[PDB]
């Protein structure tokens, strides 16, 4: 076991972790940040997507031990003092979620994608969200949610 210190949602977390522990299990089992989900074992779905050191990463294909000294953000940390983040508001307003299983990952991806590309086209949105699968929405509303968030971020 290696002792690490990861900054999760703005707070330092000094923990002892087994090297094989996937970041997704560390987030869900150790910190109880159960927003992030698991939809596959092949790294396709992206329901485990979290923001690590400025980038969108699928936490099921990253080790917690690798986050020693890293800056990690989850969906629980998106809202600011209770006020929803643009992306959270966008998915709500544009009905971008149903069962809500892929939502945390979608929000974390959109949160980063919008900083990568502030004024994306529909094609750019769809392509920029390719690492996230959804079984309920058909993606169409998710596109509108991202567009909605983009308009408010430049407001």
């Amino acid at each position: 076991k290696k002792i690490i210190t990861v900054n999760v949602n703005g707070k330092a977390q000094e923990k002892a972790v087994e090297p094989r522990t996937l970041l997704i299990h560390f987030l869900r089992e150790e910190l109880n940040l159960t927003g992030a989900h698991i939809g596959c074992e092949t790294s396709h779905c992206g329901a485990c997507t979290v923001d690590i050191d400025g980038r969108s990463v699928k936490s099921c294909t990253h080790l917690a031990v690798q986050c020693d000294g890293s800056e990690v953000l989850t969906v629980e940390g998106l809202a600011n003092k209770g006020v929803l983040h643009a992306v959270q508001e966008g998915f709500y307003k544009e009905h971008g979620l149903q069962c809500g299983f892929c939502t945390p990952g979608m929000l974390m991806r959109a949160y980063r994608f919008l900083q990568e590309n502030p004024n994306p086209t529909e094609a750019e949105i769809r392509m920029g969200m390719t690492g996230n699968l959804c079984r309920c929405t058909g993606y169409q509303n998710i596109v509108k949610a991202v567009q909605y968030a983009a308009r408010k971020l430049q407001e």
């Binding site: 290696k2 087994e18 090297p19 094989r20 996937l22 698991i38 074992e41 092949t42 790294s43 396709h44 992206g46 997507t49 980038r55 969108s56 990463v57 699928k58 099921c60 294909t61 990253h62 080790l63 031990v65 690798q66 991806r109 994608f113 392509m127 920029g128 390719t130 690492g131």
Partner: protein, 287 residues
């Protein structure tokens, strides 16, 4: 989903990493972007008792120019390849083709070096590295050696890389002014490995092909250079007939594996089609 137990190591230098490889032997594996290695470990395909993480080694990072050679750190992440102003100006092919690799999240971890070192016939960089005539710098206990992309791939998951070596950087000559290029990739969906793919780099002189490099993805146990196909074009006028001849020559060297992406019949025919589309798109980009 659950990977087997293993010991973890995180060296800060290539030398320490090389030392660890020698000390631990074959039971150790270099961990890079982890998007091929971890998935395999999570399915119990590979069970190394030691993982040597190389993400904390700064000398394996960075993109620079030394003369007319573009030096790319083995640990360069796929997205950094796409956003790199150097790669966009000097090697436009790599910047655009990297967009066809996996998805955004995977591209934030998977590195060009790991994509090459993995040696999967399904990966894109092997063919790409051949079309651009890249060279790989490998460091071991005895020092450094440089091997060509064309000759690096030996078999499925097998390359010239030795068990005590670490690929340090990918060196590729900058595109000469007016170089045409292309990478046609037939895939079932975005983020999936190619059913068939073709990388092309070419130069023009009047109505003829003055320089030509053709490589094939996922149509044999390794990525392939198609020299006979190249020979159907070099010093000849770029015509429909010549392009068709190149495809046939490329088709002739295919040895596709049958899986859910299709049979040998389909993959071979798609390789030819991608060659035809690649050459045409490359010619269009020449000046």
């Amino acid at each position: 989903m659950i990977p087997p137990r293993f010991e973890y190591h995180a060296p800060k230098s290539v030398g320490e990493a090389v030392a660890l490889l020698g000390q631990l032997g074959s039971d150790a594996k270099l961990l890079a972007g982890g998007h091929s290695l971890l998935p395999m470990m999570k399915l119990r395909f590979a069970q190394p008792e030691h993982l040597i993480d190389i993400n904390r080694i700064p000398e394996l990072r960075g993109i620079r120019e030394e003369g007319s050679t573009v030096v790319i750190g083995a640990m360069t992440v796929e997205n950094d390849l796409i956003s790199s102003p150097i790669v966009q100006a000097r090697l436009p092919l790599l910047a655009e083709a990297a967009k066809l690799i996996a998805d955004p999240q995977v591209r934030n971890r998977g590195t060009i070096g790991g994509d090459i070192a993995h040696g999967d016939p399904g990966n894109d960089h092997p063919a790409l590295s051949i079309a651009v005539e890249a060279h790989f710098v490998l460091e071991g206990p005895n020092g450094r050696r440089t091997v060509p992309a064309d000759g690096f791939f030996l078999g499925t998951y097998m390359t010239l890389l030795e068990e005590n070596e670490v690929m340090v950087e990918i060196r590729v000559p900058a595109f000469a002014a007016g170089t045409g290029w292309a990478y046609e990739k037939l895939k079932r969906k975005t983020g999936d490995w190619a059913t068939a793919g073709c990388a092309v780099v070419m130069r023009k002189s009047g109505g003829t092909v003055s320089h030509i490099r053709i490589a094939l993805t996922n149509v044999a146990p390794t990525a392939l250079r198609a020299e006979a196909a190249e020979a159907a074009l070099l010093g000849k006028a770029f015509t429909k007939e010549a392009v068709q001849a190149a495809a046939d020559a490329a088709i002739a060297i295919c040895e596709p594996a049958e899986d859910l992406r299709g049979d040998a019949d389909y993959k071979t025919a798609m390789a030819g089609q991608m060659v035809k589309r690649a050459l045409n798109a490359a010619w269009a980009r020449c000046a």
